[PDB]
Structure 1
């Protein structure tokens, strides 16, 4: 493009409206370099070196002025990288990444060029073509870098209006401006704050694990003949199914299955199997959680700073990476103790955790208007026990533990939209038997059945389904003549208004909570979101206020035909917040 390579900041660069590019090339933008800045506004196109621009008091003033509106792509990346430099970014009124995510989350828009292609704009290169792939990644020389950054800013400048126009046609403009963009700032603060980690406690757990892995690893070698890579399903498969001749219950595309569900059925045949299961559990904790956390914890602050991917999933859920903090173990006690290493950032603070109880089935009761399901939540029943009572036609005192377990698994399948092979699998029954359970469910909950039928028809007719706050998911596969592919699209038509509305609700709750915390002059702060749960830390003197405030704000985020209900706990570590 035609643009100015500026040696200093000028007044015409600080207009009331601009496309702004604050380029961070490193994937993890925490404390990462800013390699260049581009500004496009009514007066022209400008490239600035960050050493110049970020030391200029008027430019910094302009970045922080809420009344100076900026249009950007992935403003959270820029906001966080600037936070690490002590600079506040305000006034971002349009985020092209989030706009493209809302318009079609299946596109996988991850740079300006991919978003621009959605509106037939191609005068910008993909970041990968400019910087390189993995190891071959590099920042090019200034003339090349400056043209790329100005071309990205020019693209944002030209694309704001067509994206906003389509968002408005879809009734998603408020979803962008009042939900996703405010949430992006809250996520930035959460990531920047980080979670404090007790690294010595993690190290001693790693030491304990490494000893136990060593003991089980040698026991496996004695029970087998040879030594082998227990972590490679191929070598393990030769040992189990050829050397020891265990029955082959399930094959994979490349060989025999050694999944935990197959190994458990093989346990009676040979002592080695239980040890492989034990090794898999321990190795999971060591490699994924202990080693992963120690690798990414910042050694100066002893904090981990995750990155929440706000623009990735087709349901509207967040994801979390580097480290992923949304799948820290909790089901088994050995892994749950890892949560003891997540601690408040200040002495005499505590961890506070609040979770919605059954938000997805409450959402389902609301959208389906199912009388039976609505009444169960209005009575605040144990929904798994109640589902077992209806599915199996027994009174509450005849629900056995196994009945409740199988009803909970049906509830899981309904809440996530898993296939009948999925449900049969984790219930260890036949696909046919799993389908009969679903059948008995629809008979006890005929409103849910009507809703499933109607929403599949709606998806076929409109081409998409929507959530309570107008998030959209397109389902072109709903007319596929491949039965599996079509069934998958049908389940996604059912599931997305459920899981996606629950995502809408907690995102609004986060916005409301952040505003309420400031109103009430609390020091408490949000640290993590885990799909239906919010994790905070606060001075211990604030716990009593948070016990009243947090559940109320989360419960009042939307109004449904059934109440929402939030449980909460607090303690000295994340583990204790139970």
Structure 2
């Protein structure tokens, strides 16, 4: 791990020399460092170029501390770099490219040279290794503890924004970052080349996602804060009523939110035997315990209602109005592309993928999302996608025929399990088969179904036996995947995304069963994520080539909520439809139930 060959650029002539080197440089790093953690309101501070291993350059453009000398104009430097950054033939490399690209696009410079991202490379190679962050990557691959931002800043309010930070420390840190990316690239890229499936997915599914991810995050979803600042008042009043009722039942004032106090007061005053126990050993008070106890006493019911209301209020109705970006008035999310192992995108700060649906008050919370003016929400959706991947990967004629004909999968499964035809499949049989399908997706055991269906576990096993006998190809494929995990350990999805299992041969019964379940459902969710990502890429290509009156705002799991102008709804819905069924060459069709509701809940 070399160092000290780090030249910091203060004059534009050295910048010209560096760009002359860069335009002949095949691959090079790019790591813009910025004061603000935000990707939208942040103002750029400096850049970083590392054409050759150890040969890294930091280019300050605005430093705020006393006597920051010869600061190149942030506009002049970017104007001189526009031929380079906006070049397609120059392949770049970095970390979290949807951050650098967003920061650059703040100034109108649309970057186009992205080809490698160390985060994405580390994700594709071994998705269950570390956390895919520079600090972890450093020792995990290069075996070189790098300088963190904490040393320069210091935890707490004492932490310093990067812009006023002294020249030497900031420059050496950024150049070390750039240089590191190069070492990580030069080390991992041969490994990424040796793996054909991972190479395919990395080139075609993961990396073209970065520009559309940045565009989606910068577009942001619009919320009507008045709805939440109204609705929280009714939430507070209702929970106050629940407080009054609970303190009437118990005769004392306390906090329903606390769990230790709640279990103590409950199990000492009313004294029901603890049905279940927490993983920590204490008596458990989860929702099942709540409903079982509310079968007997009203205080469990009222505290369950308090939990239900308070969770949604505190998590959404209070946090979302706070997170509205004041500059543009739209909530901006950070889709972390590589954090979950399976492959799904997971929105963070705030979790837009975690908006309530099943509760009517959750329906109100989803109604809080609206359109600015003359616009209307289009909520794309894949219906029962996981079962479609199951049919494709099982090669079972029954499910393939059922999906090709287009009948509801749940009633068809119930018909094939119980014998009576699908038209006579009633509601209880229907959601019984629904539980069968979902559980088989997740790999759960018969006790789980006795819990999720309130039927004896013997009857659960009998029902799965009927299903398994009528669908032997699915079981054969699942056993093939289980066995494949033994000698390969990287049970793999369709498009080549892998998952290394360090728990397949753990020789422990507890871990291996969960490892087997993960091996079962890994191709499932992996294929679903790849299909969604490819649909995202195609739709983004359509918008960026045609520029219609549509803006993609969010990507929930198997959902692609848009925002269209009122007069476009007739044709753009059909166009995105066609773009999405033609997304992936899979035999079973990919049904897309496009809504066109005025608000997100209405479109849902």
Structure 1 length-normalised TM: 0.94
Q: Distance between the aligned counterparts of 2:310 and 2:326, measured in 1? A: 24
3-state SS in 2 of match to 1:473: coil
C-alpha contact (below 8 Å) 2:200/2:496 kept by paired residues: no
Per mean C-alpha deviation after superposition, the further-off stretch among 519-528 and 147-156 is: 519-528
The one of 101, 114, 127 aligned to 1:92: 114
* Equivalent in 285, 300, 306 of residue 279 of structure 1: 306
Question: Contact 1:83–1:192 at 8 Å: present in 2 too?
Answer: no
1:369 equivalent to 2:395? Answer yes
Q: Which residue of 1 aligns with 2:136?
A: 114
Query: Of 310, 323, 329, which residue of structure 1 is paired with 2:337?
Result: 310
Tell me which of 199, 205, 221 is aligned to 1:173: 199
Per the alignment, residue 18 of structure 2 pairs with: 13
Provide closer, same or farther for how the CA distance between residues 365 and 152 of structure 1 changes in structure 2, counting only shifts above 3 A: same
- CA–CA separation in structure 2 for the residues paired with 1:573 and 1:134: 40
Give the structure 1 partner of residue 419 of structure 2.
393
- The equivalences for 1:495-574 within 5 A come to 495-574=521-600
Separation of aligned partners in 1, 2:147 and 2:449: 44
Match of 1:475 in 2: 501
The equivalent residue for 2:47 is: 37
The alignment of Structure 1 onto Structure 2 pairs a total of residues equal to: 577
Q: Over aligned residues, Cα RMSD in angstroms? A: 2.3
Spell out the pairing of 1:193-212 with structure 2 (5 A cutoff).
193-212=219-238
Q: CA–CA distance in 2 between the matches of 1:351 and 1:39?
A: 42
Question: Matched residue of 1:48: which SS?
Answer: strand
Q: Distance in 1 between matches of 2:353 and 2:102?
A: 20
The answer to whether 1:72 aligns with 2:94 is yes
Contact 2:95 2:119 in 1 (8 A): yes
Distance 1:180 1:12, change over 3 A: farther
For the residues of structure 2 that align with 1:415 and 1:565, how far apart are their CA atoms? Answer: 19
Does the residue aligned with 1:353 lie in a helix, a strand or coil? Answer: coil
1:400-419 mapped onto 2 (5 Å cutoff): 400-418=426-444
2:66 maps to what in 1?
none
Alignment of 1:134-533 (within 5 A): 137-138=159-160, 139=162, 141-171=166-196, 172-252=198-278, 253-344=280-371, 346-418=372-444, 422-429=448-455, 434-533=460-559
3-state secondary structure, aligned to 2:208: helix
The question of whether the paired residues in 2 share the 8 Å contact of 1:194 and 1:304 is answered with yes
SS at match of 2:403: helix
Distance 2:462 2:157 in 1: 52
- Residue 560 of structure 1 aligns to a residue whose secondary structure is coil
Q: 2:74 aligns with which of 51, 54, 69?
A: 54
- Matched position secondary structure for 1:40: strand
CA, structure 1 residues 28+442, in 2 after alignment: closer, same or farther (shift >3 Å)? farther
Provide the secondary structure at the position in 2 that maps to 1:352. coil
Q: Tell me the alpha carbon deviations over residues 64-91 of structure 1, each in whole angstroms, 9 at most, x when there is no partner.
A: 3333332111111212233334443321
Instruction: Give the deviation of 1:529 after TM superposition.
Output: 1.0
Aligned residues of 2:139 and 2:145 also touching (Cα < 8 A) = no
Question: Following the alignment from structure 1 to structure 2, what is the Cα–Cα distance between the partners of residues 482 and 289?
Answer: 40
- Give the whole-Å Cα distance in 2 for the aligned partners of 1:303 and 1:566: 27
Distance 1:228 1:151, change over 3 A: same
Cα distance 1:54–1:429, how it changes in 2: closer, same or farther (>3 A)?
Answer: farther
Q: Measure the CA separation in 2 of the matches of 1:31 and 1:394.
A: 61
3-state DSSP class of the match of 1:94?
strand
Distance 1:333 1:233, change over 3 A: same
Per-residue CA distance 1:257-296 (angstroms, 9 max, x = gap): 1111111111122121221121111111101111121121
Q: What's the CA shift string for 1:150-180, capped at 9, x where partnerless?
A: 1111121233233222112111223222221
Q: Which moved more, 1:183-192 or 1:149-158?
A: 149-158
Q: CA deviation at 1:128?
A: 5.3
Name the CA distance, whole Å, in 1 between partners of 2:156 and 2:562.
35
When structure 1 is superposed on structure 2, of 564-573 and 64-73 the one drifting more is 64-73
Q: 1:474 to 1:421 in 2, by over 3 A?
A: farther
Shift of 1:134: 6.3
Is the partner of 2:381 in helix, strand or coil?
A: strand
Task: Report deviation, 1:27.
Answer: 4.7
CA distance 1:221–1:61, shift in 2 (3 Å): farther
**Conserved 8 A contact 1:199-1:302:** no
User: Could you say if the C-alpha distance between residues 24 and 433 of structure 1 is closer, same or farther in structure 2, counting changes exceeding 3 Å?
Assistant: farther
Could you tell me how far 1:129 is from its partner in structure 2?
5.7
Q: Following TM superposition, by how much is the alpha carbon of 1:555 offset from its aligned partner in structure 2, in angstroms?
A: 1.2
Q: How far apart are 1:469 and its partner, in Å?
A: 1.1
54-63 vs 1-10, greater mean Cα deviation: 54-63
Which ranges of structure 1 fall in alignment gaps of 5 or more residues? none
TM-fit CA distance, 1:423:
4.2
In 2, Cα distance between the equivalents of 1:53 and 1:222?
68
Secondary structure of residue in 1 paired with 2:491? strand
CA spacing shift, 1:29–1:170, aligned 2, 3 Å? same
**Hey, what's the Cα distance between the residues in 2 that align with 1:107 and 1:133?**
26
Q: TM-score, normalised to structure 2's length?
A: 0.90
Q: Which moved more, 1:434-443 or 1:94-103?
A: 434-443
Measure the CA separation in 1 of the matches of 2:266 and 2:349. 35
Deviation at 1:421, TM superposition (A): 5.1
Aligned counterparts of 1:120 and 1:300: Cα–Cα separation in 2: 41
Alpha-carbon separation, structure 2, partners of 1:423 and 1:132 = 51
Identify which range, 215-224 or 76-85, moves more after superposition: 76-85
Structure 2 stretches of 5 or more lacking a match?
Answer: 63-71
User: Helix, strand or coil: the match of 2:116?
Assistant: strand
Which structure carries more strand by proportion?
1
Q: Is the 8 A contact 1:106 1:314 kept in 2?
A: yes
Q: Is the 8 A contact 1:104 1:473 kept in 2?
A: yes
Task: Give the conservation status (yes or no) of the 8 Å contact 1:202–1:341.
Answer: yes
